[PDB]
């Protein structure tokens, strides 16, 4: 039967799902690891023991234990990222959307969800693979991984909690796709991994980690990169935050063993409640438990690796959105409100700047401020608000990605860079937020195709267009079959991704990025 | 007789000089101090002993001993600043242009020539007061002072050479005008001192020095201010350069006395030849012997004085030219030539930046470079050349003046700010130089009125217009009788000075000046 598939792990029974006046097969909730529950918490993922009988894969699996956003209860604009399924420590599953009739050996795309490494669900509505799978005829897989302390508590030196296990979780799913995507009609030799933000940074972390490279062909990174200031910490800091988390729970901190045992006895929610009390600074765009530069998963510093070419050379298609910072200022910078134009004042701008560059000293803050302030109209609340948006996105997303892109393109075999700057006609967030972090996804996953969603004809068109780029690129290592120029260390060309006639530009945010990538770091270091 | 005047110093016989189809009286070469020759060299000016008989004041006096420019022999564009009279250590004279018939009690304007404190002549063609005096009916006086080591060798602690004597020379002339300008028909209660560059900085130094304030009513400063990076040095540095100068002449450096004696035995030219070998850095826009913050002439640091309001509060009219740096890059930065468009390359830009900010460290140089580089077209030779022009002018002229202006306006009784950005239709210097440092003078002195000079009708008009502003302001403390707005700490309005309809703008070069006046200094200090 088209809905029954036999894998090296056991028989899997999917379900026929309708799509744009048609149907396809979906296998949801396929286990790819042993439940990381019990004494396994914090530990590396064990391979999922094979099962006898048919595994029921017709319904979404539980979501991983994560901090739930309640900043705007009932607000679609925010609840849309919230777990839409019971949360559980038993969440290591994957979902596959396979065209009908079942392919033989077609392109495979593996989606890695974001969420700051502390949240995320593959089961999210915006992650419904059925539209991409059907329209582009690809076998779409969406994995899951442990987020928060559950997947990133890093007590280096210890085997009970080495950290990075959330990354290992992504890899084991990648390992499972390599081993079983064939029986689903997918070509395990043409698998593209892609993710947004935390997923995009994850994707790039797989490009760098020696133990992950062989498990995929090419990669797509959306608003995220491995070298993002928030995507990783040192083992020292990771150890620092792990102990501090134990402190928050009145744990025996006399030994890693003592510490881990305590944390393992705590209910999941117990850890999620104090999870935020461990950051070292008052900051925006920073999360407690993220990947650690352990020396294992990451042989050396990410910078040295990018420099020495120590990483998987292949084709990469990546980009950023126009207003990456907006989402983060709305949640933690004073002066920003969801229901107001959020015009910012000097005092609030200075407060934002401070929250945005936590590691910066005074001279550094002065540097940032001077760089984004129009001293001929410094009291402009819209300029102050916008400049603060740019500061957060440039420093946390746009510039770190421009570094990686320029570092990679030197040894890579093909780079394609886009700048998504289109605002959904039906966005529910305030307009001052603009093209919000994570709002290109719906187009990538072709949501603008479902009439019930109220998108404009142009948006459906842009979605289709973007969706073809992703797939076509996944399939051929090139987005093209109007030509989206290749990015070269020389010309640095990139294109705009919106409902308007393609346009090509060069040096995406050089000025601001030369400051973020070269000057500031040199300054902060000198001082 | 209209050409004979009796002063407290002796009888002075002038000469009737023709002007724009008319005539006026001129008394040139009136001594105002005892010749600073002999053991008097380096010493403070002594009052000129009164003379019996009539002093012949119908011809220009000698020029002070200064380094002569031979960078472009015979080139009018440069020789026009060169001494047009025998140089001599006996150069302390002043010239007065008095209208005919002789006034009774009319406005007095005293011109202080520039020349980096190492050169300058009141007898220069562009300093011919006859046009201003005649047209505006003012009694125009132009003094002289000792430049170079002769007027600025600073061996603090010693009375033989305390330094700043060149400033004292200007003051003694001011003292002589206060005491004798009446017998010439000038009102010693309405005397405005004005000068360009070194003279403009001098002017402001008289506004700050307690012992100079009472000797004049208001002041006009053109492309120069007291706080310019090159207008003064510390006594330590002044002592450093004095000894180094002795070293250059194989002098006994065992004691200030030993040192001064040696330097006094040397012929003037002996000192001018090695004068440049004493700068502490490889630099542009820096001169060996300049005013010292001695604690006498300047009670405290110029910054503290400007901050505490410790200075003469009155009306000031000041401004800058568009391309102040151009003249200095043409003479010392690699890549600049008088006969080429001087398109600069990255390597030469970086070399310019280095020469422009000598005291800057690496981080500082990186700061400057990032601030003036268009990283989307960084190889543009015209942008590189222009950006380097701005760096030199902004840092050495425009920004230091914007500091002073903003500091003064807080305690002053009237500030008028202009931005002269008109290029003489008959300029002989290359066009890449633009509105060159010191090229507003000819308009201020109404040269565009003399047909033989080939100026356009508009330029003669602009000259006349500017000349009325200066005089009208000198006379009333206001340039106006189309209204040139007053500059206020709040609005910071200033106007453009060119042949086009007056336009008012605000915050003259804020961006670049916030960097030069606040950020860079904070950085250089932090690092
Ligand atoms: C660094 O990126 C993020 C940090 C935190 C969050 C998100 C992030 O990226 C956004 C889009 C997508 O990746 C998932 C969640 C995000 C939007 C919802 N908020 C509440 C959580
Ligand atoms: C800091 O200003 C200067 C430093 C050196 C020189 C001049 C300066 O200002 C110029 C205009 C006027 O003030 C007199 C001389 C100048 C033009 C001729 N050169 C050769 C000497």
Q: Is A197 a catalytic residue?
A: yes
A110 close to A190: Cβ distance less than 8 angstroms: no
Three-state secondary structure call for residue A370: helix
Instruction: Report how far residue A321's alpha carbon sits from residue A181's, in angstroms, rounded to the nearest whole number.
Output: 32
User: Which of A122, A73, A134 is CA-nearest to residue A93?
Assistant: A122
For residue A101, what is the DSSP state? S
Residues of B in contact with A399 (CB under 8 A): none
Q: Does any CB of chain B come closer than 8 Å to the CB of residue A523?
A: yes
Residue carrying the six token digits 């004041």: B57
B117 close to B199: Cβ distance less than 8 angstroms: no
Q: Give the start-to-end residue ranges of the domains of chain B.
A: 1-527
Q: How many residues are there in chain A?
A: 527
Instruction: Report how far residue A268's alpha carbon sits from residue A253's, in angstroms, rounded to the nearest whole number.
Output: 19
A411 close to A309: Cβ distance less than 8 angstroms: yes
B193 close to B138: Cβ distance less than 8 angstroms: no
Longest Cα–Cα distance in chain B: 73
- C-alpha to C-alpha distances, B426 to B77, B222, B439, B442, nearest whole angstrom: 11, 21, 11, 12
Instruction: Report how far residue B448's alpha carbon sits from residue B456's, in angstroms, rounded to the nearest whole number.
Output: 8
B436: tokens are: 């060159």
Buried b (16+ CB within 10 A) or exposed e, A336-357: bebeeebebeeebbbbbbbbbb
Q: Is A437 a catalytic residue?
A: yes
Cα B116 to ligand 2 centre (Å): 6
Phi/psi of residue B385, each to 5°? -65, -45
State in Å, rounded, how far the first CA of chain B is from the last one: 67
Give A119-161 as a DSSP string. Answer: ---TT-GGG-THHHHHHHT-EEEE-----SHHHH---TT-SS-
Distance of CA A64 to the CA centre of its chain: 15
Instruction: Report how far residue B171's alpha carbon sits from residue A481's, in angstroms, rounded to the nearest whole number.
Output: 82
Distant-in-sequence, close-in-space partners of B62: CB < 8 Å, separation ≥ 6? B85, B86, B87, B88, B90, B91, B93
State in Å, rounded, how far the first CA of chain A is from the last one: 67
Strand partners, B487: B415
B interface mutation test: which of A361, A508, A514 has the most B CBs within 10 A?
A514
What would you report as the CA-atom Rg of chain B, rounded to the nearest whole angstrom? 22
Classify residue A116 as left (phi > 0), alpha (psi -120 to 50) or beta: left
B37: tokens are: 């020759």
3-state helix, strand, coil in chain B (%, to 5): 40, 15, 45
B306 close to B312: Cβ distance less than 8 angstroms: no
Option in A366, A375, A506 nearest B511 (CB):
A375
The helix or strand, by DSSP H or E, that contains position A468, with its residue range, turns out to be helix A457-476
For ligand 2, say whether the CB of B197 is within 6 Å of any of its atoms: yes
Strand partners, B13: B4, B56
Instruction: Report how far residue A3's alpha carbon sits from residue A509's, in angstroms, rounded to the nearest whole number.
Output: 48
The helix or strand, by DSSP H or E, that contains position B238, with its residue range, turns out to be helix B235-247
A79-82 LR contacts (CB < 8 Å, sep 24+): A80/A124, A80/A125, A80/A126, A81/A115, A81/A119, A81/A121, A81/A124, A81/A438, A82/A121
Q: Is the dihedral of CA B223, B225, B228, B230 positive or negative?
A: positive
Residue carrying the six token digits 């070469």: B29
Phi/psi of residue B259, each to 5°? -60, -55
Strand partners, A74: none
Instruction: Report how far residue A113's alpha carbon sits from residue A107's, in angstroms, rounded to the nearest whole number.
Output: 20
Distant-in-sequence, close-in-space partners of B450: CB < 8 Å, separation ≥ 6? B20, B131
User: Which of A243, A77, A59, A233 is CA-nearest to residue A158?
Assistant: A243
Phi/psi of residue A415, each to 5°? -125, 135
For ligand 1, say whether the CB of A326 is within 6 Å of any of its atoms: no
Q: Minimum-distance ligand to the CA of A396?
A: 1
Strand partners, A105: none
Q: Does any CB of chain A come closer than 8 Å to the CB of residue B523?
A: yes
Q: Does any CB of chain B come closer than 8 Å to the CB of residue A457?
A: no
Q: Is the dihedral of CA A372, A374, A380, A382 positive or negative?
A: negative
Give A218-262 as a DSSP string. Answer: EEEEES--TT-TTT-B-HHHHHHHHHHHHHTTT---SSHHHHHHH
Instruction: Report how far residue A143's alpha carbon sits from residue A332's, in angstroms, rounded to the nearest whole number.
Output: 30
The residue numbers preceding gaps of C to N over 2.5 A in chain A are 481
Strand partners, B415: B316, B487
CB-CB neighbours of B450 under 10 Å: 16
- Measured between CA atoms, the residue of chain B closest to residue A521 is B363
Cα B472 to ligand 2 centre (Å): 27
Classify residue B106 as left (phi > 0), alpha (psi -120 to 50) or beta: beta
User: Which of B112, B195, B105, B176 is CA-nearest to residue B146?
Assistant: B112
- C-alpha to C-alpha distances, B293 to B155, B162, B234, nearest whole angstrom: 12, 11, 6
Distance of CA B227 to the CA centre of its chain: 13
- C-alpha to C-alpha distances, A280 to A156, A233, A236, A285, A286, nearest whole angstrom: 18, 11, 12, 13, 10
Q: Tell me whether residue A362 is exposed, middle or buried, using C-beta atoms within 10 angstroms of its C-beta: 0 to 12, 13 to 18, 19 or more.
A: exposed
B15: tokens are: 């000469």
Residue carrying the six token digits 């530069």: A293
Give A263-312 as a DSSP string. Answer: HHHS-HHHHHHHGGGG-SSS-SS--SS--B--SSSSSS-HHHHHHHT-S-
Strand partners, A220: A194, A317
B163 close to B245: Cβ distance less than 8 angstroms: no
Three-state secondary structure call for residue A96: strand
Crossing angle of helices A198-208 and A165-180, in 10° steps, is 70
* Experimental technique used to determine this entry: X-ray
CA angle B229, B384, B497 (to 5 degrees): 60
Mutate which of A197, A287, A439 for ligand 1? The one with the most ligand atoms within 8 Å of its CB, which is: A197
User: Which of B466, B439, B424 is CA-nearest to residue B136?
Assistant: B466
Three-state secondary structure call for residue A73: coil
Instruction: Report how far residue A95's alpha carbon sits from residue A445's, in angstroms, rounded to the nearest whole number.
Output: 15
Resolution, angstroms, 1 dp: 2.5
Phi/psi of residue A526, each to 5°? -60, -40
The helix or strand, by DSSP H or E, that contains position B186, with its residue range, turns out to be strand B186-196
Q: Give counts: helices (H), strands (E), chain B.
A: 18, 16
Interface of B with A in 486-515 (CB under 8 A): 506-507, 510-511, 514-515
Instruction: Report how far residue A324's alpha carbon sits from residue A343's, in angstroms, rounded to the nearest whole number.
Output: 18
- Measured between CA atoms, the residue of chain A closest to residue B509 is A376
A114 close to A199: Cβ distance less than 8 angstroms: yes
B203 close to B112: Cβ distance less than 8 angstroms: yes
User: Which of A87, A90, A106, A98 is CA-nearest to residue A15?
Assistant: A98
Phi/psi of residue B276, each to 5°? -80, -15
Instruction: Report how far residue B398's alpha carbon sits from residue A117's, in angstroms, rounded to the nearest whole number.
Output: 50
A221 close to A200: Cβ distance less than 8 angstroms: yes
CA angle A241, A281, A326 (to 5 degrees): 115
Which residues of B have a catalytic role annotated? Answer: 197, 324, 437
Instruction: Report how far residue B135's alpha carbon sits from residue B450's, in angstroms, rounded to the nearest whole number.
Output: 12
Residues of A in contact with B508 (CB under 8 A): none
Atom of ligand 2 nearest to the CA of B287: 4
Omega before B101 within 30 of 0, i.e. cis: yes
- C-alpha to C-alpha distances, A457 to A133, A446, A449, A470, A502, nearest whole angstrom: 21, 13, 9, 20, 17
Instruction: Report how far residue B481's alpha carbon sits from residue B473's, in angstroms, rounded to the nearest whole number.
Output: 9
Crossing angle of helices B381-393 and B346-356, in 10° steps, is 0
Instruction: Report how far residue B189's alpha carbon sits from residue B212's, in angstroms, rounded to the nearest whole number.
Output: 14
For residue A318, what is the DSSP state? E
Strand partners, B45: none
A289 close to A117: Cβ distance less than 8 angstroms: yes
Q: Give counts: helices (H), strands (E), chain A.
A: 18, 16
CB-CB neighbours of B269 under 10 Å: 11
The CATH number for B1-527, chosen from 3.40.50.1820, 3.10.620.30, 3.20.20.70, 3.40.1160.10, is 3.40.50.1820
Q: Minimum-distance ligand to the CA of B231?
A: 2
Three-state secondary structure call for residue A340: coil
Instruction: Report how far residue A431's alpha carbon sits from residue A348's, in angstroms, rounded to the nearest whole number.
Output: 20
Atom of ligand 1 nearest to the CA of A396: 1
B77: tokens are: 């564009």
Strand partners, A12: A5, A55
User: Which of A515, B391, B291, B517 is CA-nearest to residue B525?
Assistant: B517
- C-alpha to C-alpha distances, B386 to B115, B369, B383, B432, B513, nearest whole angstrom: 24, 13, 5, 8, 17
Residues of A in contact with B362 (CB under 8 A): 526
CA angle A378, A379, A383 (to 5 degrees): 70
Three-state secondary structure call for residue B317: strand
Q: Minimum-distance ligand to the CA of B325?
A: 2
Q: Is the dihedral of CA A394, A395, A399, A404 positive or negative?
A: negative
- How is the beta sheet containing B54-56 ordered, strand by strand? B4-7, B10-13, B54-56
Mutate which of B70, B81, B196 for ligand 2? The one with the most ligand atoms within 8 Å of its CB, which is: B81
- How is the beta sheet containing A186-196 ordered, strand by strand? A15-19, A22-31, A93-98, A139-142, A106-112, A186-196, A218-222, A316-321, A415-420, A493-497, A504-506
Distant-in-sequence, close-in-space partners of B41: CB < 8 Å, separation ≥ 6? B89, B150, B263, B264
B292 close to B163: Cβ distance less than 8 angstroms: yes
User: Which of A110, A88, A84 is CA-nearest to residue A170?
Assistant: A110
Q: Does any CB of chain B come closer than 8 Å to the CB of residue A276?
A: no
């Amino acid at each position: 039967s088209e809905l029954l598939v036999n894998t090296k792990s056991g028989k899997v029974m999917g379900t026929r799902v309708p799509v744009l006046s048609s149907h396809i097969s979906a296998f949801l909730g396929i286990p790819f690891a042993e439940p990381p529950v019990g004494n396994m918490r914090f530990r590396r993922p064990e391979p999922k023991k094979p099962w006898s009988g048919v595994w029921n894969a017709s319904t979404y699996p539980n979501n991983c234990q994560q901090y739930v956003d309640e900043q705007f209860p009932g607000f679609s604009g925010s609840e849309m990222w919230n777990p839409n399924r019971e949360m559980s420590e038993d969440c290591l599953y994957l979902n596959i959307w396979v065209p009908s009739p079942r392919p033989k050996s077609t392109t495979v795309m593996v989606w890695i969800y974001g969420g700051g490494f502390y949240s995320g669900s593959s089961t999210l509505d915006v992650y419904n693979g059925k539209y991409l799978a059907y329209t582009e005829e690809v076998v779409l897989v969406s994995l899951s991984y442990r987020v928060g302390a559950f997947g990133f508590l890093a007590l280096h030196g210890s085997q009970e909690a080495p950290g990075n296990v959330g990354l290992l979780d992504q890899r084991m799913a990648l390992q499972w796709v390599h081993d079983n995507i064939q029986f689903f009609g997918g070509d395990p030799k043409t698998v593209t991994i892609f993710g947004e933000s935390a997923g995009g940074a994850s994707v790039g972390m797989h490009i760098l980690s020696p133990g992950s490279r062989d498990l995929f062909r090419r990669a797509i990174l959306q608003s995220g990169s491995p070298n993002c200031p928030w995507a990783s910490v040192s083992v020292a800091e990771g150890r620092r935050r792990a102990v501090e988390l134990g402190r928050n729970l009145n744990c025996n901190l006399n030994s890693d063993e003592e510490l881990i045992h305590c944390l393992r006895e705590k209910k999941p929610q117990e850890l999620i409640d104090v999870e935020w009390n461990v950051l070292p600074f008052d900051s925006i765009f920073r999360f407690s438990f993220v990947p650690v530069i352990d020396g294992e998963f990451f042989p050396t510093s990410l910078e040295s690796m990018l420099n020495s070419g120590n990483f998987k050379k292949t084709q990469i298609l990546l980009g950023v959105n126009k207003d990456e910072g907006s989402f983060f200022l709305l949640y933690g910078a004073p002066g920003f409100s969801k229901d107001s134009e959020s015009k910012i004042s000097r005092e609030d701008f200075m407060s934002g700047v401070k929250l945005s560059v936590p590691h910066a000293n005074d001279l550094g803050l002065d540097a940032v401020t001077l760089q984004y302030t129009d001293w001929m109209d410094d009291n402009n609340g819209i300029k102050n608000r916008d400049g603060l948006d740019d500061i957060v996105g440039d420093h946390n997303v746009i510039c770190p990605l421009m570094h990686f892109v320029n570092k990679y393109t030197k040894f890579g075999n093909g780079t394609y860079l886009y700048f998504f700057n289109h605002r959904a006609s039906n966005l529910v967030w305030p307009e001052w937020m603009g093209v919000i972090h994570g709002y290109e996804i719906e187009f990538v996953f072709g949501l603008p195709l479902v009439k019930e969603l109220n998108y404009t004809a142009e948006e459906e068109a842009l979605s289709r267009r973007i969706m073809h780029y992703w797939a076509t690129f996944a399939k051929t290592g090139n987005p093209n079959e109007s030509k989206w120029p290749l990015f070269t260390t020389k010309e640095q060309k990139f294109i705009d991704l919106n409902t308007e006639p393609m346009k090509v530009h060069q040096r995406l945010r050089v000025q601001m990025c030369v400051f973020w990538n070269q000057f500031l770091p040199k300054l902060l270091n000198a001082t």
